[PDB]
Design a binder for this molecule. Structure first.
Ligand SMILES: Nc1ncnc2c1ncn2[C@@H]1O[C@H](COP(=O)(O)OP(=O)(O)OP(=O)(O)O)[C@@H](O)[C@H]1O
Ligand SMILES: Nc1ncnc2c1ncn2[C@@H]1O[C@H](COP(=O)(O)OP(=O)(O)OP(=O)(O)O)[C@@H](O)[C@H]1O
Ligand SMILES: Nc1ncnc2c1ncn2[C@@H]1O[C@H](COP(=O)(O)OP(=O)(O)OP(=O)(O)O)[C@@H](O)[C@H]1O
Ligand SMILES: Nc1ncnc2c1ncn2[C@@H]1O[C@H](COP(=O)(O)OP(=O)(O)OP(=O)(O)O)[C@@H](O)[C@H]1O
Lengths: 484, 488
């Protein structure tokens, strides 16, 4: 019953279905009158440690098959030849079967990361023309869709198993085996707690866990010449579902220069709570319109932080620079798929107008990306999962023409400072100019109208700070004069 | 007379053309003075268990053929070889026959995955032996190929493979035959499941291939094995397919269901059902087209889907934007084409196109749309299924105007409007059916809305309800009202 962390119910059923029908001795099979299943295939997100499962299963099924491994290329060596080889590893099994056929020989052959002749070659050998039973094959692949349809049908590959990311209880199981092994030997860390580690991590693949423990071991080794596990949590992943990177996007934090910002956050909070509640629709779409510049992206990022979903991934142009419309679309699809994988998914789209490549002249924009996006907002996550979409548009007006705007469920304005009060409020929270300086600025704005973002303001501020301590204030007022 | 589930009449024809000529003894052939046909080819959709049929024919035609099996690859070995090997395999039966030609030896060679077989010269080589200048009669070849089109024309042609067999998905009676044999074998031994009925399983399944059908049964004994350490079969029905047809799925598309908030929705559903009946009964016209036009958030896709459960057709599939992202006009065309082909393959079926305006790639500015997909759509829309075949197609749109200017609208036989709620009380009715709010607040809303005018789509409305819930109990309704007014 060891060792494989998590995957016990699914594993149990799959195990039963392939193995139990074979196992009952011996009249039972005739009574069943069912040909033994030919193969079981598992398709999983990358990094799920499918392979460990396969080695264990192969070992478990027979005293000795004894295991056969197939290189991914399979058909490597062009001249005749290789294709024949793909026929050949099977050939040994078929030969054994003709020689002893009836009972009781089982051969296991496995192809990792599974065109022309080889397709047909495998299909013919696995099923038909005559017999070919008494052997089983398991295929491990990152994506189901890539693979050919014909293999899939019940028969040659009747059962297809999808391996989910570990359950928290399951996550606790993967960590639990390694930890238990550490437990059995005297050395252990008292501070570290299994329940605590489990509660802390939702997203991680098995691998991720073994990786974390291993890193903790390295850290421990290092100390001799929470604890190490806590330090590993602090660094080691690189999870790809962790979103440590997202926090960095905002260089200057969020400044409460005024009430509207707070309103944006309680609103963001409401959106998060709603998506958390889970009735009806699990998908919500938001686009927030603000004057060019300010923390459009920053606000979105803070909302994402607030949400605390297991999976947060930010789709932005910068990652995608120079890509063909098709390449960008592929990347986007990839990220959304990854988001589908998590039970809870949070996604943000960065400068949506930029993605489309809208150009005011023309107007020319890349249609393929827009349609893909519209389908995606329209698209609904597979059951049991809730997805959060955040979109930031510099200007809505383009979008209203687009009809993009209709698709989005809710829209939040994020206006630039329009009053002297909010202005000084910003200078104060930012704490840049002196009390005297700020008093002067106030005496030069209070009662007057303004129209400037926060980031743009930050810029003007540093630009004014460069000038001598006697020219800073005047310079500032000289800048605010141009940015009206 | 065993064993092959379904495929009996066709089986009789396949049997009859090759076997009848050869079997009659012996003057009959000379009186006919007709040369025996060389080979039979059957081409089928995947999973029809064609291979089982081949095995049966191989067992059945001769006491010993002796059966010959050909690897798909055929052409393996660069060094000599493949051409030579192919000729060698062809040659032996012929040599036996030349040695004894007259009577009484017939030789059967079986071919699997012909498309791989038929590259360059090696394909040419096969052709020569069958159509060979001297004799070569009394040799029988059967080829199983998933796709007919790929194979060279000369093989299809009378002579080497005069007869071409097309194998249809199992008939319900036939489906009953495939299930019936395994079940019967189970019947013969004492163990059986009393609850399970063959007719019931058959009525439940229309679409499935015979191999797949065996597979559910395979699932079922296994479930029984689990049990020892309807019934199990019912569970298998729940998770055996993987049908590749219908895939129940609709609940996933129809997430919240179809409540009866209004008079119009019922009329529309009924209309759809009447049209379904009409499809089922009209012989003059093979193809039926319908289009649903509504303001955005109407629920048009869900309604179309609802109609699809209602038809109860053997094969139901939905053509979706969601499925296709990032493709190029030609890729969209291929996918659409294949799906519609799949519909032709079934005897009668309903195919639903969802968000057509989106499907085209259309955007309001320009306007910009991708032409190739659209043309594909129109030709497909005009088009008539192979005779004796009926297809039901549903189109979902909100941009009717654009379609009308386009001339898209004209192709459709009929259009049914699917209007957003216009009376506030009707909207209230939707609320009690959904049953979300408590009695008093609903009364307050009723006081607020009665007598006033509204334009709310149903999905959009539910979303508004969800938005309303999030606020505190004494902050739920006012929030809702504010959303409605803002939406105004
Ligand atoms: N839940 C788990 N059960 C078993 N092994 C796991 C699990 N999570 C991670 N692993 C690790 O993963 C390995 C086997 O699965 P693996 O992650 O290799 O699948 P994979 O998709 O091939 O991985 P990768 O894509 O990172 O190469 C084992 O060595 C084990 O350390
Ligand atoms: N009150 C605040 N609101 C928003 N951002 C703030 C605030 N205080 C400091 N910042 C910092 O300002 C940055 C905002 O940049 P952002 O691009 O989001 O603004 P923008 O006007 O949308 O610019 P762009 O037009 O390039 O999108 C963030 O990195 C954030 O950390
Ligand atoms: N209607 C049916 N009649 C006979 N056999 C069936 C039927 N449905 C399923 N089968 C099973 O399927 C097998 C024959 O169909 P098979 O899957 O070989 O056709 P195929 O399309 O050539 O398969 P593939 O293309 O996947 O290799 C038999 O072993 C039989 O048990
Ligand atoms: N009478 C009705 N007609 C349609 N949908 C209804 C009805 N009553 C309740 N609903 C619910 O509303 C939802 C409508 O979903 P659907 O995706 O069809 O909307 P839609 O027209 O596609 O919206 P959009 O076209 O803007 O994406 C379904 O979950 C359905 O259960």
């Amino acid at each position: 019953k060891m060792g494989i962390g998590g995957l016990d119910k699914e594993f149990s059923d799959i195990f039963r279905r392939a193995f139990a029908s074979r196992v009952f001795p011996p009249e039972i099979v005739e009574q069943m009158g069912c040909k033994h299943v030919k193969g079981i295939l598992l398709y999983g997100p990358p990094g799920c440690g499918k392979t460990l499962l396969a080695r264990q299963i192969g070992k478990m099924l027979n005293a000795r098959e004894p295991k056969v491994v197939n290189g991914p290329e399979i058909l490597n060596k062009y001249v005749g030849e290789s294709e024949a080889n793909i026929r050949k590893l099977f050939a040994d099994a078929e030969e054994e079967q003709r020689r002893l056929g009836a009972n009781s020989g089982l051969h296991i052959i496995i192809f990792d990361e599974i065109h022309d002749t080889v397709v047909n070659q495998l299909l013919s050998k696995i099923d038909g023309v005559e017999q070919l039973n008494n052997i089983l094959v398991i295929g491990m692949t990152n994506r189901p869709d890539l693979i050919d349809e014909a293999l899939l049908r019940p028969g040659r590959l009747e059962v297809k198993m999808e391996i989910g990311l570990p359950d928290e209880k399951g996550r606790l199981q993967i960590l639990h085996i390694h930890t238990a092994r550490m437990r059995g030997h005297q050395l252990l860390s008292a501070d570290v707690d299994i329940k605590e580690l489990a509660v802390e991590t939702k997203n991680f693949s098995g691998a991720e866990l073994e990786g974390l423990v291993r890193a903790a071991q390295s850290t421990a080794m290092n100390r001799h010449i929470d604890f190490l596990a806590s330090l590993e949590n602090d660094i080691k992943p690189a999870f790809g579902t962790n979103q440590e990177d997202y926090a960095s996007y905002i260089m200057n934090g969020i400044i409460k220069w005024g009430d509207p910002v707070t309103r944006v956050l309680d609103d963001g909070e409401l959106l998060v709570q709603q998506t958390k509640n889970s009735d009806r629709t699990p998908l919500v779409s938001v686009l927030l319109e603000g004057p060019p510049h300010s923390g459009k992206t920053a606000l979105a990022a803070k909302i994402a932080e607030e949400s605390n979903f297991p999976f947060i991934k930010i789709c932005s142009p910068d990652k995608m620079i120079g890509f063909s419309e098709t390449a960008k679309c592929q990347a986007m699809k990839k990220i959304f798929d990854d988001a589908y994988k998590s039970q809870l998914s949070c996604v943000v789209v960065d400068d949506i107008e930029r993605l489309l490549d809208y150009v005011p002249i023309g107007p020319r924009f890349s249609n393929l990306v827009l349609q893909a996006l519209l389908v995606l907002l329209k698209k609904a996550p597979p059951q049991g999962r809730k997805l959060l979409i955040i979109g930031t548009t510099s200007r809505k007006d383009v979008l209203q023409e687009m009809e993009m705007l209709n698709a989005f469920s809710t829209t939040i304005h994020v206006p630039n400072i329009a009053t002297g009060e909010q202005l000084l409020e910003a200078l104060e929270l930012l704490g840049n100019f002196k009390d005297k300086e700020r008093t002067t600025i106030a005496q030069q704005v209070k009662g007057k109208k303004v129209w400037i973002g926060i980031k743009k303001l930050l810029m003007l501020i540093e630009m004014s700070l460069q000038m001598d301590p006697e020219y800073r204030v005047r310079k500032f007022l000289a800048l605010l004069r141009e940015e009206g």
